[PDB]
């Protein structure tokens, strides 16, 4: 009867392309209780307000979280020709969403750091003719096709991965490359919230 945000506080948050997604229905939420544990650096919403999203009732609430460096805050905007929205994470444009970038304080010890931040800088299909490239843009609310050939954390900027497709799948290869970003003293996370209005059991407290 209370929406459990606890999982977020345990472990290494995944890199952006492997964002963890908590779906909530029929439960009550205290969003400030969660956010008050971090040092929130940004809190931006689309078609809802920070005050409104903290206090409305929805048919479902969806919370994505990942490791994300504050320095790249700009890349995390729908209007960026950049790789973060092309091949990693892209938020719904048919539902209200908020985007929170936060820094993990020192008493928050159950969140751990990966060795670096990393993301996908290319996820393309190589056709069975072995010459033409077809970028696999990520879709809102989905994972990049390439998430299964890209490691949990990239090891070196520029690493290159590839998977061959069966002939049923059209042959050729699925092909990707990753970028890396120097870790920060304290982990920096992004939280993606997207709410759905339908009949609305997900309510505040």
């Amino acid at each position, epitope marked *: 009867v209370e929406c459990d945000f606890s999982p977020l506080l345990s472990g290494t948050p995944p890199q952006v392309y492997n964002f963890k997604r908590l779906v909530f229905t029929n439960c009550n939420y205290n969003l400030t209780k969660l956010l008050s544990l971090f040092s929130v650096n940004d809190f931006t919403c689309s078609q809802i307000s920070p005050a409104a999203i903290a206090s409305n009732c929805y048919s479902s609430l969806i919370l994505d979280y990942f490791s994300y460096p504050l320095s790249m805050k700009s890349d995390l905007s729908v209007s960026s020709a950049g790789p973060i929205s092309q091949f990693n994470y892209k938020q719904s444009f048919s539902n209200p969403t908020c985007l929170i970038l936060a820094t993990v304080p020192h008493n928050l010890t159950t969140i751990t750091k990966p060795l670096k931040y990393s993301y996908i800088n290319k996820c393309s299909r190589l056709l069975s003719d072995d010459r033409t490239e077809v970028p696999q843009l990520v879709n809102a609310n989905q994972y990049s096709p390439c998430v299964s050939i890209v490691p949990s954390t990239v090891w*070196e900027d520029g690493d290159y991965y590839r998977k061959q497709l069966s002939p049923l799948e059209g042959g050729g290869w699925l*092909v990707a490359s990753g970028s890396t970003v120097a870790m920060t003293e304290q982990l920096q996370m992004g939280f993606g919230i997207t709410v759905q209005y339908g009949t609305n059991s997900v309510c505040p407290k």
Partner: antibody
Framework: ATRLEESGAEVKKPGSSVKVSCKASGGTFSSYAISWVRQAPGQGLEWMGRIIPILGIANYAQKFQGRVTITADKSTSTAYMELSSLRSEDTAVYYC?????????????????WGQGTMVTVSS | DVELTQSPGTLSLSPGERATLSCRASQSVSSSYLAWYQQKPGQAPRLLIYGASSRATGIPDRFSGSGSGTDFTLTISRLEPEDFAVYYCQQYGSSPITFGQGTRLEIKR
């Protein structure tokens, strides 16, 4: 399966430049991560750079950041290595090398596809 | 670069015995990023092991790798006559990729 055929041995005068070639056959080409490793007689192995044809551009070791130029022609299924300003210690067998199958993590830097080699001699 | 120092420079053993080849590293190397090659006179090297647990296809299961941190090991369960060659380790977690000096394996007559 997929194989790498290199260009014949070749003699070069100190100070000149050599272009060793490496042609692939038996499969495809553009997805491969093709390295160049060289080896001096009686000596161990030395990695020089690598190119992935669709990724466009090569990447080199700092030592050979002059100097060496790795390129690929996706129509010849051929990659090349070029090495300027030769020298009596730059004489060695020059191996063309790659990985087979799918590439996860750093596994394309382990080499289970090798060419026959190319002995490049520098002498007056 | 990272310096990989193999030992002994030459190993003397008879067929049927157990070989232990060492590879020591100047820095720590993740065992995800260490491989071992076999080379025979006049031939390209051939991939054997690329740890932490992979083994190259078509490679005898009597080669296995172990070790972590700084000291790594290529074990050869039972030597067959064709296993007598030069062995090289390789690290590929740090740039640039470095190889080792070589251990030579020869028959103890």
């Amino acid at each position: 399966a997929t194989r790498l055929e290199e260009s014949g041995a070749e003699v070069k005068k100190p100070g000149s430049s050599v272009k060793v070639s490496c042609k692939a056959s038996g499969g495809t080409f553009s997805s491969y991560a093709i390295s160049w490793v060289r080896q001096a007689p009686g000596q161990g192995l030395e990695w020089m750079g690598r190119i992935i044809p669709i990724l466009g551009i090569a990447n080199y070791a700092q030592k050979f950041q002059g100097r060496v130029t790795i390129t690929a022609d996706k129509s010849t299924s051929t990659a090349y290595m070029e090495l300027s300003s030769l020298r009596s210690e730059d004489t060695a067998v020059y191996y063309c090398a790659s990985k087979q199958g799918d590439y996860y993590d750093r596994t394309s830097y382990a080499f289970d596809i090798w060419g026959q080699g190319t002995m490049v001699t520098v002498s007056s | 670069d990272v310096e990989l120092t193999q030992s002994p420079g030459t190993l003397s053993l008879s067929p049927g015995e157990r070989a232990t080849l060492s590879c020591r590293a100047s820095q720590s190397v993740s065992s995800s990023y260490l491989a071992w090659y076999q080379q025979k006179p006049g031939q390209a090297p051939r991939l054997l092991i690329y740890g932490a647990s992979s083994r190259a296809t078509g490679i005898p299961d009597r080669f296995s790798g172990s070790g972590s941190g700084t000291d790594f090991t290529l074990t050869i369960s039972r030597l067959e006559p064709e296993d007598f060659a030069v062995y090289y380790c390789q690290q590929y977690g740090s740039s640039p990729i470095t190889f080792g000096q070589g251990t030579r394996l020869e028959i103890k007559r």
